[PDB]
Amino acid sequence: GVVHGVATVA
Amino acid sequence: GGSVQAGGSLRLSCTISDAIFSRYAVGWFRQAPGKECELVSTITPDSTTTHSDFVKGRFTLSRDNAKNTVYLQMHSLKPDDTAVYYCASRWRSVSEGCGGQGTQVTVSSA
């Protein structure tokens, strides 16, 4: 199923 | 999260499972306050990038050359770009794209 990444400010 | 004045810029990073990063498209999604999840753009392992119609060249995607990270570079931000931004792969619907850990982007008027 879906795989979520981790989103942050670069 | 990150916050700017209208007209500003922001870069977001997405770190995702190495097995996924190497093999599958990674999508960026966003969800504005009181609105539904929407797909923004995608990038494949060969750096083919797709964009939704509302991007209009302002947001661009790239892959890090060494790490399992995708970058979303945003320029010319406007208040209606305020949203939580998420990244995902292998989604079964656009709704699933906003189910993970997202980062809040806030764009305030000038």
Query: Tell me, what CATH number does B79's domain have?
Result: 2.60.40.10
Range(s) of the domain holding residue B100: 2-108
Cβ pair B88, B29 in contact under 8 A? yes
Name which of B72, B106, B48 is nearest A5 in CA terms.
B72
Kindly provide the resolution of this structure in angstroms, with one decimal. 1.3
* Count of domains observed in chain B: 1
Angstrom distance (rounded) from CA B110 to CA B101:
29
Q: How was this structure determined?
A: X-ray
**B13 vs A: CB within 8 A:** yes
Angstrom distance (rounded) from CA B39 to CA B35:
13
Best of B4, B14, B41 to disrupt the A interface (most A CBs within 10 Å) is B14
Write the Ramachandran bin of B34: left for phi over 0, alpha for psi from -120 to 50, otherwise beta: left
A4 is in an annotated binding site: yes
